[PDB]
Amino acid sequence: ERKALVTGGSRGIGRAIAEALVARGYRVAIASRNPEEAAQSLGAVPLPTDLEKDDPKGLVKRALEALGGLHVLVHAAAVNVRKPALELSYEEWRRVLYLHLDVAFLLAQAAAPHMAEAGWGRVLFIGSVTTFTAGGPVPIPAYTTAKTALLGLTRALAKEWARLGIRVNLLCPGYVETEFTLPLRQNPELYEPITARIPMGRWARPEEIARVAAVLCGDEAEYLTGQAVAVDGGFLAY
Amino acid sequence: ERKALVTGGSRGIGRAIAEALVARGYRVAIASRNPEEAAQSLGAVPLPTDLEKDDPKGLVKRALEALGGLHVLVHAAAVNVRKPALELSYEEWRRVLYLHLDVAFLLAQAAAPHMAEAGWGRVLFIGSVTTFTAGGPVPIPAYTTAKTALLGLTRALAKEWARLGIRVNLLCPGYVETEFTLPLRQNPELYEPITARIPMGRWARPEEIARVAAVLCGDEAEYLTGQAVAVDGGFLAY
Amino acid sequence: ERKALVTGGSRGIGRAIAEALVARGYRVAIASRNPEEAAQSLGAVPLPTDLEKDDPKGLVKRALEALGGLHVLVHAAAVNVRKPALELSYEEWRRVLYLHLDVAFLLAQAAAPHMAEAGWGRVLFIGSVTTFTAGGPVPIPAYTTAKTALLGLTRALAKEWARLGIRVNLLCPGYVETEFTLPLRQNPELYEPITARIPMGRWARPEEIARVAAVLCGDEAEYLTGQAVAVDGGFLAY
Amino acid sequence: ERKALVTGGSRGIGRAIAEALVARGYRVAIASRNPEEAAQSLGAVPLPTDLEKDDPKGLVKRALEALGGLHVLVHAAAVNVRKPALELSYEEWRRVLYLHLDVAFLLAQAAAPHMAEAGWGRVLFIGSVTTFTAGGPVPIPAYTTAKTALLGLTRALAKEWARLGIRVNLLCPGYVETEFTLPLRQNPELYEPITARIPMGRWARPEEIARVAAVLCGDEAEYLTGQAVAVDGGFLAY
Numbered sequence: 001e002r003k004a005l006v007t008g009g010s011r012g013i014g015r016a017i018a019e020a021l022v023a024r025g026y027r028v029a030i031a032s033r034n035p036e037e038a039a040q041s042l043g044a045v046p047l048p049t050d051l052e053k054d055d056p057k058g059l060v061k062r063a064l065e066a067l068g069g070l071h072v073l074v075h076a077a078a079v080n081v082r083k084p085a086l087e088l089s090y091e092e093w094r095r096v097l098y099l100h101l102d103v104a105f106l107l108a109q110a111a112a113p114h115m116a117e118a119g120w121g122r123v124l125f126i127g128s129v130t131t132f133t134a135g136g137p138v139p140i141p142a143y144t145t146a147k148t149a150l151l152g153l154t155r156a157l158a159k160e161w162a163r164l165g166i167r168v169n170l171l172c173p174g175y176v177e178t179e180f181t182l183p184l185r186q187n188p189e190l191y192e193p194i195t196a197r198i199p200m201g202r203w204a205r206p207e208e209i210a211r212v213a214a215v216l217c218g219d220e221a222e223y224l225t226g227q228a229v230a231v232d233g234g235f236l237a238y
Numbered sequence: 239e240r241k242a243l244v245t246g247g248s249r250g251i252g253r254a255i256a257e258a259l260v261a262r263g264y265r266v267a268i269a270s271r272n273p274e275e276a277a278q279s280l281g282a283v284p285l286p287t288d289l290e291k292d293d294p295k296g297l298v299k300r301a302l303e304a305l306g307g308l309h310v311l312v313h314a315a316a317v318n319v320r321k322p323a324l325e326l327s328y329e330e331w332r333r334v335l336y337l338h339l340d341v342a343f344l345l346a347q348a349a350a351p352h353m354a355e356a357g358w359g360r361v362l363f364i365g366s367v368t369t370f371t372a373g374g375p376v377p378i379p380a381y382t383t384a385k386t387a388l389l390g391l392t393r394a395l396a397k398e399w400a401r402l403g404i405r406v407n408l409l410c411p412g413y414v415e416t417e418f419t420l421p422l423r424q425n426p427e428l429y430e431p432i433t434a435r436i437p438m439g440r441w442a443r444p445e446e447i448a449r450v451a452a453v454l455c456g457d458e459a460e461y462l463t464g465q466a467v468a469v470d471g472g473f474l475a476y
Numbered sequence: 477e478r479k480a481l482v483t484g485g486s487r488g489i490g491r492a493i494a495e496a497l498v499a500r501g502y503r504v505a506i507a508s509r510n511p512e513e514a515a516q517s518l519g520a521v522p523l524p525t526d527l528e529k530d531d532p533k534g535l536v537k538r539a540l541e542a543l544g545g546l547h548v549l550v551h552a553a554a555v556n557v558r559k560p561a562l563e564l565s566y567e568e569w570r571r572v573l574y575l576h577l578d579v580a581f582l583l584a585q586a587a588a589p590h591m592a593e594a595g596w597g598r599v600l601f602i603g604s605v606t607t608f609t610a611g612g613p614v615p616i617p618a619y620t621t622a623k624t625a626l627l628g629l630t631r632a633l634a635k636e637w638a639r640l641g642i643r644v645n646l647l648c649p650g651y652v653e654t655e656f657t658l659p660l661r662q663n664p665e666l667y668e669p670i671t672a673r674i675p676m677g678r679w680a681r682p683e684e685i686a687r688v689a690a691v692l693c694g695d696e697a698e699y700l701t702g703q704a705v706a707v708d709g710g711f712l713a714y
Numbered sequence: 715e716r717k718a719l720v721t722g723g724s725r726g727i728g729r730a731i732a733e734a735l736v737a738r739g740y741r742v743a744i745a746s747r748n749p750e751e752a753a754q755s756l757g758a759v760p761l762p763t764d765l766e767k768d769d770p771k772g773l774v775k776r777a778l779e780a781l782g783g784l785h786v787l788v789h790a791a792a793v794n795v796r797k798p799a800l801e802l803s804y805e806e807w808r809r810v811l812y813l814h815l816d817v818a819f820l821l822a823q824a825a826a827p828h829m830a831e832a833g834w835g836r837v838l839f840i841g842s843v844t845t846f847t848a849g850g851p852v853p854i855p856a857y858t859t860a861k862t863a864l865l866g867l868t869r870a871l872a873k874e875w876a877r878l879g880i881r882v883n884l885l886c887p888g889y890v891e892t893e894f895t896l897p898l899r900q901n902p903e904l905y906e907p908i909t910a911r912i913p914m915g916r917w918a919r920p921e922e923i924a925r926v927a928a929v930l931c932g933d934e935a936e937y938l939t940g941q942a943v944a945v946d947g948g949f950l951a952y
């Protein structure tokens with residue numbers, strides 16, 4: 001019955017979220033460049049797309065048609081350029097901000113009318129501990145800016161769409177074991193100082209993050225909107 | 239199998255949380271001055287106590303004995319003195335801070351060893367939108383101070399007990415329909431300006447708040463600790 | 477002796493900041509489309525530019541040449557498209573994000589080497605109460621997103637440039653009497669609900685905001701960096 | 715002309731603040747157990763008191779009489795019990811909360827009428843990075859709770875007293891070189907992991923913190939109230 005679109009649903013956190021939603025009985029479509037294999041394994045509809053180039057409006061239209069509706073949107077598609085501000089080019093800055101922020105806006109804007117028609121919707125953007133900090137030993141100014149910007153977008157859309165039955169929140173994972181953060185794990189000068197600040201003493205498994213994502217995509221969030229929810233093993237609280 | 243103690247479990251939010259936990263299969267004990275009737279209706283163990291006077295350590299000991307263990311602690315017992323700072327006496331200030339904050343510390347401190355023995359625990363303190371604001375048109379300086387203090391306590395205990403398998407979080411409800419907030423609802427100069435700032439356009443039902451409380455008292459919060467989670471219909475985001 | 481560039485220095489807050497810096501003995505250059513008259517009145521160097529189109533790098537180069545150095549950067553140039561998310565076009569979204577955020581990054585990136593050479597620098601971005609909220613009754617999703625994004629950029633640049641002697645902060649004014657907010661003041665449904673939330677009971681004068689801006693552009697901020705400083709008459713605290 | 719009372723004014727940050735206020739032409743009184751020597755060196759009026767036992771109301775009365783008025787209140791008196799929550803006794807918990815929080819409330823409550831009579835006042839509470847975190851490797855749950863509670867009190871009093879001409883803020887210093895933090899500096903396992911997170915790469919000198927305190931005790935803060943201002947060398951932003 002609930003129809004969901006998960007971008008970045010072929011790997012890591014996005015895949016875990018798609019998995020959790022399927023487990024809840026949702027009909028799910030995953031979008032990535034080569035989603036076929038993961039979709040078949042997952043029991044989801046594959047929607048091939050390059051979100052760094054393709055019109056987000058088109059993906060939402062394809063999702064609506066493929067699923068027979070659209071109630072949930074999760075934007076997990078990931079990219080990054082880990083360079084200090086003085087080294088980063090404007091092109092690289094825009095590449096990161098476009099996929100993380102602009103596409104978030106465009107996807108949500110396109111999906112909202114469908115959720116409104118159903119009188120129920122859930123938009124879940126993915127933030128980071130960098131929504132509240134600058135990444136510590138890691139040089140990620142563009143990413144930090146984009147993930148913090150998402151909290152403003154979250155509040156803004158939540159405010160405007162609340163009466164339409166749509167809830168908009170920002171899931172902020174801590175340090176999770178996925179391919180995206182391999183560079184962090186392979187550099188002791190990055191991994192050790194960071195992990196020393198995680199009270200639980202370990203990084204998260206994608207499925208542990210997805211447990212909370214599912215909640216934010218369900219009836220549990222009926223009165224929860226315009227908020228960031230950090231699932232970081234205690235990192236920010238340290 | 240999971241054993242839970244819910245103070246303030248005979249009415250409002252606390253009762254709704256106790257209800258939600260029983261629905262999850264948890265064995266629950268509710269503590270309030272006259273919990274008998276609610277406990278029988280709820281399917282919970284009654285633990286009569288006046289938390290404004292009785293040693294919190296004693297209540298935890300009684301809960302452990304009554305339930306055959308203790309994995310979850312929810313402190314919802316409520317009181318307030320709605321007077322401006324210049325009118326408030328030190329006694330009144332202490333009355334509010336004691337029940338909301340000191341008792342939170344004492345209950346958690348007493349419960350932690352039991353959760354640690356089990357290798358799994360959940361502590362849920364109850365915050366407020368006043369954990370982030372001063373209550374707007376309502377004169378509640380002591381309450382605001384206590385609910386904000388709880389976020390510091392939440393971070394502190396989460397940091398220290400993470401390795402013991404205990405998660406500590408602060409559920410921050412927005413404006414909820416309970417007896418505690420009747421004064422707000424019966425004064426147009428309070429109710430209208432506040433409600434105009436709630437994007438969803440309505441106050442919450444206790445059960446809607448409890449849906450999230452249950453999550454924070456379950457496996458969904460395995461990697462979620464030291465955080466405030468606001469369930470306010472968009473109020474803070476407005 | 478300290479050389480400062482203030483974009484948006486011909487009117488409102490930017491003009492007040494330029495004024496305050498000149499009062500501190502700083503040599504100031506103001507940038508706007510037609511800065512001549514204000515510059516002459518102010519005792520500042522005029523730098524004509526259209527920051528919605530002209531390469532930010534070029535403006536910084538011109539400022540360095542005009543002032544004989546560059547130690548302080550204040551980005552106050554303003555624009556907005558007050559339309560709800562579902563009405564806003566991607567072009568309009570980009571127009572707001574470009575001037576408020578992208579240009580902030582580009583200007584700071586270009587100015588940093590000059591501040592580093594001097595071993596002392598101050599970057600002051602201008603945030604808003606929308607860095608922490610969604611603007612309440614005002615439909616400003618793009619602006620909210622940009623002003624919140626600036627806090628991430630502030631933290632990121634502050635972290636990377638601290639050792640170079642540069643401090644980076646975000647001054648977040650509340651509701652100020654300038655031409656930019658005239659639309660808010662001329663609509664009772666906007667002005668009254670907002671002002672009712674300002675404890676001081678009145679909007680700010682640009683010079684009152686500039687008093688704090690000057691501090692963040694001086695030696696007082698030697699150990700203050702990567703922070704937002706809200707000057708809002710108590711609005712956020714309400 | 716402006717009269718100020720600085721508790722904890724004989725050493726460290728409090729002394730530096732008293733010094734900065736005297737430099738601004740304020741008539742200052744410092745309160746500590748043995749303030750005589752520092753007061754004479756400082757050019758301030760000594761007010762002997764043990765704030766862990768003596769009625770705060772009495773100190774304010776003595777300050778009013780000694781200074782011929784009272785416009786500014788800075789509460790820097792310090793104490794701490796660095797023990798984990800499970801080791802900490804309720805007495806120790808109360809000792810920390812009383813001096814840091816209860817006394818802050820009592821002093822401000824007593825001073826407000828004097829500031830109101832003058833139509834101008836400044837209350838400056840002292841927070842910490844633990845107003846936003848749990849202290850990292852340092853076991854300070856009571857202190858963390860108290861310093862976070864102060865932000866709630868700050869917002870609450872700022873809201874209620876804004877119309878009286880009083881501004882109330884929370885100065886949150888990072889890691890400062892004073893006797894109070896010697897234990898941190900003498901333990902490599904504490905000092906190194908903490909300092910590695912300070913972008914500026916060094917701890918602050920008390921006078922650097924006082925530069926900002928003075929601003930919050932002056933006309934610069936005319937429109938700044940109910941806020942925390944962190945002066946931490948970039949620690950929180952890291």
Ligand SMILES: NC(=O)c1ccc[n+]([C@@H]2O[C@H](COP(=O)([O-])OP(=O)(O)OC[C@H]3O[C@@H](n4cnc5c(N)ncnc54)[C@H](O)[C@@H]3O)[C@@H](O)[C@H]2O)c1
Pocket residue numbers: 007008009010011012013014015031032033034049050051052053075076077078079126127128129172173174175176177178179180181
């Ligand atoms: N890994 C972490 O520790 C961590 C922490 C906080 C936030 N996040 C956020 O979580 C989200 C998921 O990241 P992850 O770690 O699971 O990454 P991942 O590398 O495991 O997965 C990235 C997904 O995005 C997809 N993708 C990449 N480029 C794409 C494109 N051009 N078009 C469509 N899809 C594309 C991939 O195919 C994949 O399905 C991101 O928004 C990321 O910034 C991750």
Ligand SMILES: NC(=O)c1ccc[n+]([C@@H]2O[C@H](COP(=O)([O-])OP(=O)(O)OC[C@H]3O[C@@H](n4cnc5c(N)ncnc54)[C@H](O)[C@@H]3O)[C@@H](O)[C@H]2O)c1
Pocket residue numbers: 245246247248249250251252253269270271272287288289290291313314315316317364365366367410411412413414415416417418419
């Ligand atoms: N109602 C709201 O809108 C709202 C919003 C944010 C936070 N909260 C918080 O939620 C919690 C619950 O409040 P609520 O609105 O459900 O209140 P409520 O009046 O509905 O219930 C209060 C509970 O505390 C109990 N209680 C009162 N005094 C007690 C004592 N001395 N010893 C033991 N138990 C005692 C009552 O018997 C009852 O079970 C509180 O911590 C409150 O501050 C409420």
Ligand SMILES: NC(=O)c1ccc[n+]([C@@H]2O[C@H](COP(=O)([O-])OP(=O)(O)OC[C@H]3O[C@@H](n4cnc5c(N)ncnc54)[C@H](O)[C@@H]3O)[C@@H](O)[C@H]2O)c1
Pocket residue numbers: 483484485486487488489490491507508509510525526527528529551552553554555602603604605648649650651652653654655656657
């Ligand atoms: N007015 C408020 O209540 C308020 C509140 C919070 C934040 N702010 C922020 O403060 C800053 C200043 O706004 P303000 O209210 O003083 O506005 P303003 O209208 O008074 O001044 C705007 C300045 O930007 C300049 N400008 C506009 N377009 C430009 C362009 N294309 N190129 C170069 N300069 C251009 C103007 O010429 C002028 O000097 C902005 O960043 C704004 O978002 C304002």
Ligand SMILES: NC(=O)c1ccc[n+]([C@@H]2O[C@H](COP(=O)([O-])OP(=O)(O)OC[C@H]3O[C@@H](n4cnc5c(N)ncnc54)[C@H](O)[C@@H]3O)[C@@H](O)[C@H]2O)c1
Pocket residue numbers: 721722723724725726727728729745746747748763764765766767789790791792793840841842843886887888889890891892893894895
């Ligand atoms: N040192 C830091 O790195 C740091 C960081 C953040 C916040 N703070 C806060 O700054 C404030 C000042 O601390 P500090 O580091 O300058 O400490 P300090 O040890 O240098 O000075 C403490 C002051 O409090 C006084 N004092 C102690 N007990 C007293 C009592 N019973 N009655 C009256 N006065 C008493 C002392 O005599 C002294 O003047 C405190 O509120 C502290 O928690 C300090």
